[PDB]
Ligand binder design. Structure first.
Ligand SMILES: Nc1ncnc2c1ncn2[C@@H]1O[C@H](COP(=O)(O)OP(=O)(O)OP(=O)(O)O)[C@@H](O)[C@H]1O
Ligand SMILES: Nc1ncnc2c1ncn2[C@@H]1O[C@H](COP(=O)(O)OP(=O)(O)OP(=O)(O)O)[C@@H](O)[C@H]1O
Ligand SMILES: COCc1c(COP(=O)(O)O)cnc(C)c1O
Ligand SMILES: COCc1c(COP(=O)(O)O)cnc(C)c1O
Ligand SMILES: [Mg+2]
Ligand SMILES: [Mg+2]
Ligand SMILES: [Mg+2]
Ligand SMILES: [Mg+2]
Ligand code: NA
Ligand code: NA
Lengths: 310, 310
């Protein structure tokens, strides 16, 4: 009785992004998550300053060699996110692969971090020579991917202007490999305002009888006037967690994931406003996620937003 | 309204030692703990194999500069443990000195890892050139130290054959600087039977009126027939937590600390035996701390041991 996860992400001393946004939450939910830190920086790169070291593909390979020699290369899930190096990303592919040989039932949850959009136009935040690797090597191996609108577009090659185009892109993404695709954020039109960001879910699965079916969901989340870092990593981590508990219920899984984010952010923005005054926009430091103060919400998130069925 | 802790210890991918044994429990208890991973290995050195890389003193300084450049050099506590390099430890002393300059109220919890004793004879397991650094620079800075019997011996130059010699050696360490000294394990005889190890605590403090008072405690812990790794790091992390919540009550802080280790170990030995099989001695892998499954015990440990005031 234990679920083992190998998470290969960034590590920071101060703050919560990468393995720091993902680890504590999964530990609180009872997963045996082993963290491989692809980097060690003082804090995330949205700060005015930051210093640190990165891990190269050789060292990553070296670290994996250790686990293998000890016959500890048996996981239930693998989790990856922001990766800045192509050789590193390739080594990750070689690793997930072997781990999948060892355990065919392994679920590779992949957050294909490539970039995002701002105001209107989007741009990459990672080496462009990563996109082909993700397309031909990483995604075909993935079981669950969580790209944002911009990443869904780059991966599929199609731009998204409406919900129906999103769904079509999702199907394209399903054909590339993963049975679960969740667009974690988008500027799609919303009947509630425009102050809302849209989340779209799509999961294909074989039912008991053996019929292959697909469940689709949509969520309209009201925007918080501030920029957060780590929340996508958190999103992917909780999705892993909740699909694990509700494997045939994408609706409930996403509602628990999105609600956990809501409570963490609500608490985070309250503490930030007070920290740096009335009217003052909080600094990156003050906007760090109140992760430990949110233990209870992570354990049993009260559902504050139900998804609409598609 | 945070209590920030800076823990500089080792990191392993699989298992619980160093920062792996200290972070989760401190996070669970509500502390904003930031982890500097002095090393990143696949697993602890108690296994037949282990690969990984170390962090050099330049890199440690580099990371520290990132924190300083951002004004994130304000901690309430600093926690250190096993260090193999003398250069690294020196750099650590310099960092603590400055952090103390930045905050005169900072509490430095030092676990002076040097070695241990297997049935009678002691043995060091880190460079011998570290003892002077510890005696001269490290311990003088520390506010709370927690050596096992052997380290306290080395640190003082005085052999411990009984409780009262242990209390005399602890009084010597207080004079070296630290106001709280806790011997985390010893060969001392117990009126409980041979199957018991002894823990001794000593706290030098000031009372309202303004006079310096001493509190001395003893605990007889039932030995578990197995070698665990990470338990000392956990002891030091939990002693930090509970002394923080119970400032002038070494007795309680120790009862909660030792009780926590008790529940964690009872759960560990049980799962280990269930895997190894009746009669069979569990392997290191099977004895890895059941940290995540012990969350509730960490939050509020049921006191299964009462400390006797000396
Ligand atoms: N400003 C915000 N207001 C409200 N919710 C937000 C905000 N920022 C992030 N979130 C929450 O975090 C989730 C992830 O969004 P984010 O924009 O953080 O990740 P992404 O950009 O979607 O993922 P990634 O960059 O890792 O591929 C959103 O779906 C939402 O639930
Ligand atoms: N075999 C065991 N049986 C019972 N308790 C144990 C056992 N091993 C460790 N412990 C628990 O761990 C605590 C610390 O002992 P350990 O021997 O683990 O650390 P130390 O050697 O005292 O510290 P360090 O090695 O970090 O300087 C003990 O006080 C006890 O609570
Ligand atoms: C600008 O990148 C910040 C960042 C994030 C942000 O994730 P998100 O909160 O935008 O989802 C994750 N990992 C690392 C290492 C990061 O540096
Ligand atoms: C023999 O030391 C094992 C070990 C510990 C043990 O702590 P303890 O369980 O003996 O208290 C801590 N950190 C590293 C890197 C270690 O390798
Ligand atoms: Mg975004
Ligand atoms: Mg990310
Ligand atoms: Mg010991
Ligand atoms: Mg130790
Ligand atoms: Na995403
Ligand atoms: Na000790």
């Amino acid at each position: 009785e234990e679920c083992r996860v190998l998470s290969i992400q960034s590590h920071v001393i101060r703050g919560y992004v990468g393995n720091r946004a993902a680890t504590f939450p999964l530990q609180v939910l009872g997963f045996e998550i082993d963290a491989v830190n692809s980097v060690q920086f003082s804090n995330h790169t949205g700060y005015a300053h930051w210093k640190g070291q990165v891990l190269n593909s050789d060292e990553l390979q070296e670290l994996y060699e250790g686990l293998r020699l000890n016959n500890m290369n048996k996981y239930d899930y693998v989790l990856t996110g922001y990766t800045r190096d192509k050789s590193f990303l390739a080594m990750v592919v070689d690793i997930v692969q072997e781990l999948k040989q060892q355990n065919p039932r392994l679920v590779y949850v992949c957050d294909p971090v490539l970039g995002d959009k701002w105001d209107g136009e989007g741009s990459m935040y990672v080496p462009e020579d990563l996109l082909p690797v993700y397309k031909e090597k990483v995604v075909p191996l993935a079981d669950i991917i969580t790209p944002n609108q911009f990443e869904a577009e780059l991966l599929s090659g199609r731009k998204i202007h409406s919900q129906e185009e999103a769904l079509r892109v999702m199907d394209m993404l399903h054909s590339m490999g993963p049975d679960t695709v969740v667009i974690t954020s988008s500027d799609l039109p919303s009947p509630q305002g425009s102050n809302y960001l849209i989340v779209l879910g799509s999961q294909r699965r074989r039912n008991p009888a053996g019929s292959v079916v697909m469940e689709r969901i949509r969520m309209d989340i009201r925007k918080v006037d501030a920029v957060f870092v780590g929340t996508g990593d958190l999103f992917a981590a909780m999705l892993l967690a909740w699909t694990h508990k509700h494997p045939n219920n994408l609706k409930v899984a996403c509602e628990k994931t999105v609600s956990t984010l809501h409570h963490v952010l609500q608490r985070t923005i309250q503490c930030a406003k007070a920290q740096a005054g009335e009217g003052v926009r909080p600094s990156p430091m003050q906007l760090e996620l109140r992760m430990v103060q949110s233990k209870r919400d992570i354990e049993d998130p009260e559902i504050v937003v139900q998804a609409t069925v598609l």
